[PDB]
Design a protein around this ligand. Structure first.
Ligand code: FAD
Ligand code: 0IM
Length: 337
């Protein structure tokens, strides 16, 4: 289990927060998972599940058994020609899993290229980028019920996916995701809305891009645009794009013509949270070891040595400021512990 007592979690979270865990364990299959659960209950410690720690804000030492999800395995479950059911263990790194699928001639994940973290965590916040969400390709997952240690299958409906949401984020600490099955395709027409990805592919002379072509562009753009936690600690975008009803939307639009929004299919307008933050004057803000990125206004950052409490406090000031200015509450994307 590679059990360690009073272990620094600093290399295990992309924010780079240095808090200690009472017990740190690395799980490399379901047996290790069941063992750690027995251990946590034996020692009367809660169990905190961690993947790549890239959606995690740790604010204090962790009096719990921290289980690092490191199980390995990727496989084609069944080939149906135009679609292919693939399966990966929870501890599989997400982006190497995307590449594994693309090397196999499968499409569906290319817009989710270069997202950090693990396969296991991906259903929890319904990972999404470039107009694609995990739920678009999701077939099923196997999860351990942490109430009674049974195994349950969740199909797409049972997962109650939502924008950066899922049953598992709503019922926290209840389900331990062990492996995830996705339906990828071959020979589908690549649907790409106007934007920088499509523009770069046109520049490369590519009017019918393969999934691999799309993935190469999106990797390049993300490596150009998004701070790397390796250099500057962060958990990606800190806030979700908030929705407003047509009432608040027309009022905010009357107060700001430059208001960057997205009209939804249900009639509401999803606001661009980075615009709220930028126009709050927050872009590039720094306060000691924490700050907001000078260009990606959604990315709160640890310049080095920050505590999670310092990050949370900065997030709270931005939230309160945006509340006080725009009448809009920014929800966080990372999970705070
Ligand atoms: C630079 C950077 C860029 C990012 N870009 C995006 C993006 O474009 N789109 C997007 O959606 N997200 C993005 N993220 C957020 C993060 O990468 C995703 O949310 C990812 O799915 C988190 O996976 P993880 O393994 O690191 O989860 P962790 O951070 O390790 O865990 C996050 C939550 O999931 C729980 N959890 C983890 N594994 C399991 C498991 N097997 N079973 C049950 N619960 C579990 C954890 O308890 C925790 O609550 C980015 C993060 C960073 C640092
Ligand atoms: O929608 C997208 O296409 C997209 C493209 N990059 N990032 C992004 C990811 C992490 C930090 C900041 C931005 C997004 C998203 F997270 F906002 F979702």
């Amino acid at each position: 289990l590679e059990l360690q007592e009073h272990c620094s979690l600093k290399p295990y979270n992309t924010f780079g927060i240095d808090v200690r865990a009472r017990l740190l364990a690395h799980a490399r299959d379901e047996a290790d998972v069941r063992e750690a659960l027995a251990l946590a209950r034996e020692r009367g410690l809660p169990l905190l599940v961690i993947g790549g720690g890239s959606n995690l804000l740790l604010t204090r030492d962790v009096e719990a058994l921290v289980l690092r999800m490191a199980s390995q395995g990727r496989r084609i479950v069944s080939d149906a020609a135009d679609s292919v059911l693939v399966e990966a263990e929870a501890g599989e790194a997400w982006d190497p899993f995307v590449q594994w699928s693309l090397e196999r001639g499968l499409a569906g994940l290319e817009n989710l290229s270069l997202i950090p973290g693990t396969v296991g965590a991906a259903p929890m916040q319904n990972i999404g980028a470039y107009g694609v969400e995990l739920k678009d390709v999701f077939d099923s997952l196997t999860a351990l019920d942490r109430q009674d240690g049974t195994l349950r299958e969740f199909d797409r409906q049972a997962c109650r996916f939502g924008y950066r949401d899922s049953l598992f984020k709503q019922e926290p600490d209840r389900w331990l995701i062990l492996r995830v099955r996705l339906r990828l395709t071959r020979r589908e027409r690549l649907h790409l809305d106007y934007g920088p990805v499509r523009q770069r592919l046109e520049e490369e002379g590519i009017a019918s891009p393969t999934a691999r072509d799309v993935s190469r562009v999106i990797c390049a753009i993300r490596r150009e645009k998004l701070p790397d936690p390796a250099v500057l600690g962060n958990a990606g975008s800190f806030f979700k794009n908030p929705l407003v009803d047509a009432t608040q939307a027309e009022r905010l639009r009357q107060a700001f013509p430059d208001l960057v929004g997205y009209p939804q299919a249900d009639g509401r307008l999803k606001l661009a949270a980075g615009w709220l933050i930028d126009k709050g004057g927050w872009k590039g803000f720094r306060d000691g070891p924490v700050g907001v990125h000078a260009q990606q206004a959604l990315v709160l950052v640890n310049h080095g040595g920050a505590t999670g409490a310092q990050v949370r406090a900065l997030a709270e000031r931005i939230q309160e400021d945006v509340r006080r200015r725009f009448g809009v509450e920014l929800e966080p994307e990372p999970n705070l512990y």
